[PDB]
Amino acid sequence: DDSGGFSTTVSTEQNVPDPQVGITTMRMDVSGVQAPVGAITTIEDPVLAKKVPETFPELKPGESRHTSDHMSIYKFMGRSHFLCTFTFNSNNKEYTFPITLSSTSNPPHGLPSTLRWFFNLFQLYRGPLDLTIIITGATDVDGMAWFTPVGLAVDTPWVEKESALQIDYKTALGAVRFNTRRTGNIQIRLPWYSYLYAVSGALDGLGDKTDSTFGLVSIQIANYNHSDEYLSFSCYLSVTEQSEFYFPRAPLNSNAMLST
């Protein structure tokens, strides 16, 4: 031991991640003629709690009949889930929304149904995300979207107003330029630009307003509008292969799972 401790017992590793592949496959019977000693146990001992359970004679389940494994995070959360939606009402306006992992921020100003469930299953998130925005409404509208890391100057979140920034400051952060007649969709990465190791969701105090947000996406539109037509944007998040997840955590209860 490096720390100078001593013990006569054995210390074992508790709750090892990923103990089994969640597809039916083969890595005779499962239980058999031998008497099941794993039926009776002591749960207060972490060594005896790792014993394989059996009580009844069984046999092997066989193999499944679909190729993919739906119980993996990189395939479950590879599906792009809903993030936010908002509408514009006037000309030359600017809207700003952060991607906050915190569970204190309730929707509409926070993570909705499935993303609120997922980012409170674990402690630490580190890596780039994957944003898709969808344009619904007017046509011949020129818009520009850019990405600001946390700790830098930007307009007020969740408020649609005129922009107090200049065009030299917007285009220096990296921006895209679209038109609502040609595309109707933008599939854009979001870089991992932070000064800290990883961001977390389940925090309070001044750690909730610092270590929860990691990035911040804002959109400005021009050439809107003519007489009577609405313009609506909707955002969707997916996860990438460069991202990582650490330290599993107790899931949210049935009163914190909220939606829009």
């Binding site: 008497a35 099941p36 039926a39 009776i40 009580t55 009844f56």
Partner: protein
């Protein structure tokens, strides 16, 4: 130094589904052993699942007349629901289990005199006698009964179902459905019997039984 042995505290006993964890245990006390009979009191093979479940049972008795027209339906019967009855020996295996997976063996028997003429068809239709054609009943596993040629047909089918097993207490829909249609009309002369008797035998094959349950 001598060691004084004591009785064991913890032990696990049972027979393959009942598990008993005991904090105060003791060894088993057995007298005698298993003996064979050199002069046997019963010379048949002993009972098992094979000789009780896989055995022919009479499930239906109809009668085919000269007044039934063409494509008239002599017998329309659910095969698996009729085998789930107290009067058959397979009930003692099915009353206590929950799900099953099985194959079906059908034998259909008639008896005409050779002064009669006519025909029948005996098709195994899975699930439902739906909107399909009556003239295309030879696509299913079937058998043709002609009064001149034969009087016994026999059919063997595997398990065809939308789920993995069949629930006897609360089924979704019937697995198999046997129909017996008039394929050519029964004609007689003067004095000949205007009927013939019909019987359907059925049994399971490859019977799997899962999940024994207390509630029926």
């Amino acid at each position: 130094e001598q060691m004084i042995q004591s009785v064991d505290r913890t032990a696990v006993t049972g027979a393959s589904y009942f598990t008993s964890v005991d904090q105060s245990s003791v060894h088993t006390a057995e007298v005698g052993s298993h003996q064979i009979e050199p002069l046997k009191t019963s010379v048949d093979k002993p009972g098992s699942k094979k000789t009780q479940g896989e055995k022919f049972f009479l499930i239906h008795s109809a009668r085919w007349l000269t007044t039934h027209a063409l494509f008239h339906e002599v017998a329309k019967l659910d095969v698996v629901k009729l085998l789930y009855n107290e009067q058959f020996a397979v009930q003692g295996l099915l009353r206590y289990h929950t799900y099953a997976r099985f194959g079906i063996e059908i034998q259909v028997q008639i008896n005409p005199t050779p002064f009669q003429q006519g025909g029948l068809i005996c098709a195994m239709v899975p699930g439902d006698q739906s909107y399909g054609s009556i003239a295309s009943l030879t696509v299913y596993p079937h058998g043709l009964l002609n009064c001149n040629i034969n009087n016994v047909v026999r059919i063997k089918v595997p398990f065809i179902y939308t789920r993995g097993a069949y629930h006897f207490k609360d089924p979704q829909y019937p697995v198999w459905e046997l129909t017996i249609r008039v394929w050519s009309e029964l004609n007689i002369g003067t004095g000949t019997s205007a009927y013939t008797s019909l019987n359907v035998l059925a049994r399971f094959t490859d019977l799997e039984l899962h999940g024994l349950t207390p509630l029926s």
